[PDB]
Design an enzyme around this catalytic site. Structure first.
Site: not given
Lengths: 459, 459
Positions: B8, B11-14, B16, B124, B126, B129, B145, B165
């Site tokens: 869906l 991110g850089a480290f996750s 979904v 964070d 933005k 989210n 998130d 951010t």
């Protein structure tokens, strides 16, 4: 004058495309040079390129047929060769030996000798210039593209500029020495070496170090792969990769070298799979190092086609979409009416005694059961012809169809059964009436309903 | 426990992905965090993330259902919301006004108020989210998130680290000041501003200059686009983008601001097409920033567009000649023989008096012409039942088929005509014989040949 078709290859400042000469019907390769992206000097030196390429008439050199300049483009039209690169072809082969590399290098040296004899030095010999004439087995190797080629005066050397491709550059060009024909024999040594083991003699990530290697002549023949190469192949490479151009083998002398001229007793016949495997990677690394043009302004090729065969139109859709589900199972059938149409035309054709129209609506191998056949099965239309010729060619007669039933059996087949009642007059009427029970079996062949069989009773 | 389906978002480290709880049959979003790529500290702070997300129970906040760690991965399982980003949705809408932006910001502020009341600061906030609950009309905006969220103690401020951010970072975070809840109200001011005109209040190619702009509070309301924004929307932005966090509006106070609480008399109803147009570009620039490094199991090619072309083949197949030598050369399709098979089974069924098998091979609406009908057309099987029940239920009888002809009319239709001769005995035989001419019209319906009509003569 010409019509451009598919792209065959590229450079930074040119593409090559198949084209057809409109008035000739002959096909060619068009080298299309974007002159807006050239220096004034390289634009001007297209005159030299055009001239060199007209001079050169040799079986192993692609020749120029025409040269045209427009406002932003120059067009150099050459023979079309359709086999692609020699190097790509070598890796798709079932067998590849020293004897096969010798035949490649001989063809290249023959071409180069012809250049040198015409006072042309190529200067930028590399795998990309080595094309096959066709996809046929044993097609000739052909030199293509002389965009960096120069004209020389006899055996005189000069400083013609720093030009070439890094891995194939001669030491004298790198030392800034006056140069000439031998630069092409250095490049042939590099090509020969790659043809034998699949990797170049000089390589370095750092271009300055590469050039020091070239200038030093610091190549080697490492084991295991060079251990099975003949001493005579190594000798020819050594003679070509000689640092002092005055001592380097010439194209004439290379062609007399035993590994070439005595190939059948000198060059090994052993398949070199490792060369084939290394060359694949070499070929691939060559096709990543490149660039792409920003825009693609091109012409439009001929489009369209004529449809093949006859297709039924069918019922037109009532609309693009609706609330009611499409294709409801229970509805009035137009198809049954179509059968009724061809059937009424049949009855009218029989009544009028028109055997011509009766023939069209009947299959040539029509099957028939009727009382006029006396319990036998009749094939063809010869049998009913006797009744079309004699009787029906004519007192008042009225036909009446009662209780028609139609069975639809797919798009191309149908069957109708009904009762035919005929009112007529016999001799001096005395009006009479007769009953018959008739079955017709219709079949659409090539967009036309035809009777394949019919059955009649009590007539 | 779970089954992963489509991705869906990222991110850089996750990533979904939609998933289904195996034993439940309920669907969820799985946040899949590659723990091998996290710092020890960020891995450890997943405990804090998991905890914060369980605490938070609000209609405008997506909640956590489960948390699982394996050897290389952590899984945070949340409610599935299916509407995608608010910001993407705004640009696909037919109408978008201040009154509509007010409803967005009210929902966001309600969520943020709930966080603040639970001692959670998001840090964070933005556009990414801000998700919609579903694709239904008027779906709620939901916060998703909290990976950078922190827990605070009452109204105490602290230095929780430099996190956020760039465009949404508060001045106090950039000054390295202790901070708390107000950081989220600064970010809401930036979001509100983007919701009104489609571009951010602070932007610079140079990140150091961006931060000086933020710290100075150096945003503006330029004409033409701000000229039609109400003074009350500008007042709320000003109150949120206040440099001194002690003087910045709180989430509770923002919710009482007339542009929110008196929306119906205060917020403009005018469609802002220019906002919609700018937001499209904003949305696009957000999705294309180049990653600093790229890491994946396979290179990965995106899938989408249409599947045109691919015309189907005709499919006719040639029949191989039998290998054993044959005295006479003939080759009709085995289909003719198939018709012969079902026909022989028909004759045997009639002879045995088996009305059961006779029913299967006949269409329920079978048409019939026969001498037992006295020139009439009979529909159904009721008529022949009288002969199956009475007569055929039985002295020696031998049938003989003479001169059979078969017309094949497509895959699903056929017709056979033949002469039937019956040898029998009458009373005290006295052997007798009778002739009839028969036509059968077969039609394959649902993979089974059935008689749709038949015709008989002289019986």
């Amino acid at each position: 004058m010409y019509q451009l078709f598919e792209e065959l290859g590229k450079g930074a400042f040119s593409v090559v495309r198949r084209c057809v000469k409109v008035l000739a019907g002959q096909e060619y390769a068009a080298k299309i040079i974007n002159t807006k992206k050239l220096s004034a000097r390289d634009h001007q030196k297209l005159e030299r390129e055009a001239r060199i390429c007209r001079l050169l008439k040799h079986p192993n050199i692609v020749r120029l047929h025409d040269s045209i300049s427009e406002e932003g483009h120059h067009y150099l039209i050459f023979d079309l060769v359709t086999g692609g690169e020699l190097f790509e072809d070598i890796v798709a082969r079932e067998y590849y030996s020293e004897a096969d590399a010798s035949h490649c290098i001989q063809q290249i040296l023959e071409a180069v000798l012809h250049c040198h004899q015409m006072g042309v030095v190529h200067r930028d010999l590399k795998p990309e210039n080595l094309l096959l004439a066709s996809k046929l087995k044993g097609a000739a190797v052909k030199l293509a593209d002389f965009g960096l080629a120069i004209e020389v005066e006899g055996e005189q050397q000069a400083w013609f500029g720093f030009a070439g491709t890094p891995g194939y550059l001669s030491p004298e060009v790198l030392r800034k020495d006056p140069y000439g024909k031998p630069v092409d024999l250095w490049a042939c040594g590099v090509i020969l070496y790659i043809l034998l083991v699949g990797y170049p003699p000089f390589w370095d990530e750092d271009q300055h170090r590469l050039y020091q290697q070239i200038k030093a002549g610091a190549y080697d023949f490492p084991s295991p792969e060079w251990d099975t190469v003949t001493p005579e192949a190594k000798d020819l490479i050594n003679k070509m990769l000689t640092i002092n151009p005055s001592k380097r083998i010439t194209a004439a002398e290379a062609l007399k070298h035993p590994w070439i001229s005595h190939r059948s007793t000198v060059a090994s016949c052993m398949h070199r799979q490792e060369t084939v495997d290394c060359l694949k990677k070499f070929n691939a690394r060559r096709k990543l190092k490149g660039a792409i043009l920003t825009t693609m302004l091109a012409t439009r090729n001929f489009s369209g086609g004529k449809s093949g065969g006859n297709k039924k139109s069918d019922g037109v859709k009532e609309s693009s979409e609706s609330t009611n589900t499409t294709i409801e199972d229970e509805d009035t059938k137009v198809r049954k009416q179509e059968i009724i149409k061809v059937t009424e035309q049949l009855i009218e054709a029989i009544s009028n005694g028109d055997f011509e129209s009766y023939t069209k609506m009947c299959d040539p191998g029509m099957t028939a059961f009727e009382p006029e056949a006396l319990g036998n099965l009749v094939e063809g239309l010869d049998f009913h012809r006797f009744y079309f010729e004699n009787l029906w060619s004519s007192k008042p007669v009225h036909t009446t169809i009662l209780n028609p039933h139609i069975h639809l059996m797919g798009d191309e087949s149908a069957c109708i059964a009904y009762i035919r009642i005929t009112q007529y007059l016999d001799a001096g009427g005395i009006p009479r009436t007769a009953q018959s029970e008739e079955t017709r079996v219709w079949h659409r062949r090539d967009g036309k309903w035809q009777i394949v069989h019919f059955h009649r009773s009590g007539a």
